[PDB]
Design a protein around this ligand. Sequence first.
Ligand SMILES: *[C@@H]1O[C@H](CO)[C@@H](O[C@@H]2O[C@H](CO)[C@@H](O[C@@H]3O[C@H](CO[C@H]4O[C@H](CO)[C@@H](O[C@H]5O[C@H](CO)[C@@H](O)[C@H](O)[C@@H]5O)[C@H](O)[C@@H]4O)[C@@H](O)[C@H](O[C@@H]4O[C@H](CO)[C@@H](O)[C@H](O)[C@@H]4O)[C@@H]3O)[C@H](O)[C@H]2NC(C)=O)[C@H](O)[C@H]1NC(C)=O
Ligand SMILES: *[C@@H]1O[C@H](CO)[C@@H](O[C@@H]2O[C@H](CO)[C@@H](O)[C@H](O)[C@H]2NC(C)=O)[C@H](O)[C@H]1NC(C)=O
Ligand SMILES: *[C@@H]1O[C@H](CO)[C@@H](O)[C@H](O)[C@H]1NC(C)=O
Ligand SMILES: *[C@@H]1O[C@H](CO)[C@@H](O)[C@H](O)[C@H]1NC(C)=O
Ligand SMILES: *[C@@H]1O[C@H](CO)[C@@H](O)[C@H](O)[C@H]1NC(C)=O
Length: 157
Amino acid sequence: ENITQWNLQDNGTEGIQRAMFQRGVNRSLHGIWPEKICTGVPSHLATDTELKAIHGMMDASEKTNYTCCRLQRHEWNKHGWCNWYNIEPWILLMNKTQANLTEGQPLRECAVTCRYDRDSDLNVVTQARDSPTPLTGCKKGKNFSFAGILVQGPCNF
Ligand SMILES: *[C@@H]1O[C@H](CO)[C@@H](O[C@@H]2O[C@H](CO)[C@@H](O[C@@H]3O[C@H](CO[C@H]4O[C@H](CO)[C@@H](O[C@H]5O[C@H](CO)[C@@H](O)[C@H](O)[C@@H]5O)[C@H](O)[C@@H]4O)[C@@H](O)[C@H](O[C@@H]4O[C@H](CO)[C@@H](O)[C@H](O)[C@@H]4O)[C@@H]3O)[C@H](O)[C@H]2NC(C)=O)[C@H](O)[C@H]1NC(C)=O
Ligand SMILES: *[C@@H]1O[C@H](CO)[C@@H](O[C@@H]2O[C@H](CO)[C@@H](O)[C@H](O)[C@H]2NC(C)=O)[C@H](O)[C@H]1NC(C)=O
Ligand SMILES: *[C@@H]1O[C@H](CO)[C@@H](O)[C@H](O)[C@H]1NC(C)=O
Ligand SMILES: *[C@@H]1O[C@H](CO)[C@@H](O)[C@H](O)[C@H]1NC(C)=O
Ligand SMILES: *[C@@H]1O[C@H](CO)[C@@H](O)[C@H](O)[C@H]1NC(C)=O
């Protein structure tokens, strides 16, 4: 029912993808997205201490040097409060999702966005999710690279 999406390292993509490559991070959670997007005022304002409890999730912002908490707070504000009601079960789910992502390539890993790399003739996956979706920036007929793992098609197992 929820889309789980994450960033993947890629030295060829400026921003979080490059920062992850430099730090030896392969997968960094972007979000867990139910159908409903939160509108209005959050029932609770996420603190830095709460957001830092999602261990290994890197912020997409250079303003924190890709650490915490701009993306983490944005996730709680836009997808968290209205769906989970309380920050505690959301922090635990996000943290466990990230822990699984840190362990290696997950159960279902489908490409979302690629950076086609001319040199290696590979579709370098910059963002993946746990369900198939139409692709963006992915060259037809090329193999896919999920944080160095070579796959035939857009979905990795
Ligand atoms: C996919 O995303 C959804 C979010 O869309 C995730 O579901 C959410 O999971 C949260 C648990 O992790 C759960 O949080 C608890 O919510 C209760 C309140 O629950 C009651 O309210 C809601 C609506 O008002 C109803 O939820 C029911 O919805 C479904 C269909 O009816 C079904 O799942 C089931 O019937 C649910 O019961 C329902 O009326 C609820 O009973 C809070 O009380 C919880 O609080 C915990 O308890 C404390 C107080 O005792 C609180 O202070 C603590 O901090 C404590 O931890 C807790 O917040 C959400 O209700 C649920 N949201 C929805 C819309 O279902 C789902 O888990 C995701 N799945 C995956 C696999 O990623
Ligand atoms: C993190 O990974 C573990 C291991 O895959 C998950 O636990 C499994 O959950 C499935 C159902 O989704 C069950 O069939 C098994 O009981 C579990 N296996 C083990 C070895 O414990 C867990 O769901 C994952 N959590 C998140 C949030 O991704
Ligand atoms: C990241 O992925 C590569 C390629 O699969 C693997 O060799 C390496 O050990 C992983 N590093 C971490 C920190 O998980
Ligand atoms: C950003 O983080 C990395 C690794 O932790 C480090 O190389 C760098 O000095 C940090 N700070 C700035 C201002 O780039
Ligand atoms: C989150 O997962 C880590 C492993 O990455 C674990 O050590 C830690 O206790 C967890 N934190 C919370 C708040 O669950």
